[PDB]
From a paper:
The reabsorption process of urate in the kidney by the urate transporter URAT1 plays a pivotal role in controlling serum urate levels. URAT1 (SLC22A12) is a member of the SLC22 major facilitator superfamily transporters. The cryo-EM structures show that hURAT1 has the common architecture of SLC22 family transporters, which is formed by the N-terminal domain (NTD) with an extracellular protrusion and the C-terminal domain (CTD). Structural comparison between different conformations of hURAT1 reveals the rocker-switch-like mechanism for urate transport.
In the presence of substrate urate, hURAT1 predominantly adopts the outward-facing conformation, in which regions of the NTD and CTD in the inner leaflet of the plasma membrane bind to each other to seal the intracellular gate. Urate binds in the center of the transmembrane domain of hURAT1. The three protrusions on the electron density match the three oxygens on urate, unambiguously defining the binding pose of urate. The xanthine core of urate is wrapped by a hydrophobic cage consisting of five phenylalanines, including F241 of the NTD and F360, F364, F365, and F449 of the CTD. In addition to the binding by these five phenylalanines, the negatively charged 2’-oxygen of urate (pKa ~5.4)20 is coordinated by R477 on M11 and the 8’-OH of urate binds K393 on M8. In the outward-facing conformation, the lower regions of the NTD and CTD bind together to form the cytoplasmic gate below the urate-binding site. Particularly, F449 in the CTD blocks urate release through the cytoplasmic exit. On the cytosolic side of hURAT1, we found that E223 on M4 and R284 on H4 of the NTD made electrostatic interactions with R465 on M11 of the CTD and D525 on the loop between M12 and H7, respectively. To evaluate the functional importance of the observed polar interactions on the transporting activity of hURAT1, we mutated them into alanines to disrupt the interactions. We found that R465A and R284A mutants dramatically decreased the urate uptake activity of hURAT1, although with slightly decreased surface expression level, suggesting that both R465-E223 and R284-D525 interaction pairs play critical roles in stabilizing hURAT1 in the outward-facing conformation.
Residue numbers in the entry: 1 to 57, 68 to 79, 85 to 100, 112 to 325, 334 to 533
Amino acid sequence: MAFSELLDLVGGLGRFQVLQTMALMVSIMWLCTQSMLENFSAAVPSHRCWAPLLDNSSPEALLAISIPPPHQCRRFRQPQWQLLDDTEPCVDGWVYDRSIFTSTIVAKWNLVCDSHALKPMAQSIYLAGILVGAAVCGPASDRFGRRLVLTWSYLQMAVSGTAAAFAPTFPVYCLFRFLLAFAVAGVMMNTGTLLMEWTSARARPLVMTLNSLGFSFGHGLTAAVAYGVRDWTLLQLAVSVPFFLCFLYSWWLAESARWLLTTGRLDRGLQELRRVAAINGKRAVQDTLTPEVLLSAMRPASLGTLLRTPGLRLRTCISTLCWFAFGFTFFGLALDLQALGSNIFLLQVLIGVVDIPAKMGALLLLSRLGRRPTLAASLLLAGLCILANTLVPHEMGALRSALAVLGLGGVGAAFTCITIYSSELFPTVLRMTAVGLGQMAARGGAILGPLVRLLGVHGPWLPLLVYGTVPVLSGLAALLLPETQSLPLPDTIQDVQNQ
Ligand SMILES: O=c1[nH]c(=O)c2[nH]c(=O)[nH]c2[nH]1
């Protein structure tokens, strides 16, 4: 089933591939904005208990007499006039700090100091959504299309985001964040695969790196939009409309002809190849793509076949392990830069600006070393920066922050290498199912991150020890799965079993 011959008869690396890469990178930027805006639409302001002597009838002088030390969950039922020289719970409302953020979900639904474990839970739900999303968008994309799921996931992202921007109660907001996360999983996996299966190997790592840099630039776009737009409602709506645009233009993409011709469909694959030839101006071969030529090229995915198949069991388990390590470390480390600076937008900008050169260096490394050595190196670096950060004598001059940022760079490199490795490591029949299993593992790691952060009671170093031991062991396990370079993309189980 030789497809690179067809990608060369048709336009390879033509204007179609670059246009698709740009559009999908932009959509990924907006998707990262959706994912990372829980730091801005759910930011916790400086709150206190609504007291009769403050907000009814000096601030600093009249606040010390009406709120015990300022406590965010209790207030003096009756102020003690013998305090300038007997408490009560926060039953009068709340008063938030509306100077940095005009409004957020935390301030809107009073998720403070008694329901404080609802801001993380909501985030967890989002992660859970992506998990479930993969479980229903991985196999589905392997049965109905790489682009059909992408288009309907764009539409679902737009609709769910616009509905969450107008949620009247917290459960409705959580439900629509869950549905948005479902569509987010669909979009991420289908975008990665669709870029994987339309670019010739010459510039396949490059376009996958551009797609991954989509998230890196979305980390800065989040800060830009959240700086321009402060209210959580307007922020969510302004991030969700771009996905209405993405769904609108997503009908001009081409269904991945590798998947199309891999399955029993041939007229659809022929039409997509002819359209791609017409887009990038291939004159003679547009009509010389007759079904005779396609036959001369010589060309049910429900998570129940992938994880039990003799041909690929080490591949799936190790790839999902590396995905889990990436999710674990990345979502335990994204919020770990708070010690670098107090500013909140600068942290998002910093994450983007340290993932950009990390992914460029990973692209160079994998185009020089190879997928497996570079993945092992990136995971080992990301998992050993933490195990060395836990040994720093805490002078935080030029060692603590350096390791903290090298860990993030290694995590970004690991992600941009594991996307390529997982896409190239599985047959086109099970490519999206396996990438969906990887996304489920990554979201499971992200969910379990804060849960294992609770180990600080038994030891200040145990959470860091786990957060660094998982990537080290995953990278040392990423030296067992087979190398995938100068090998054509497998598009059936027999192709993998041939290797
Ligand atoms: O689900 C994700 N959210 C991100 O913010 C991100 N950033 C990155 O590099 N990969 C991912 N994946």
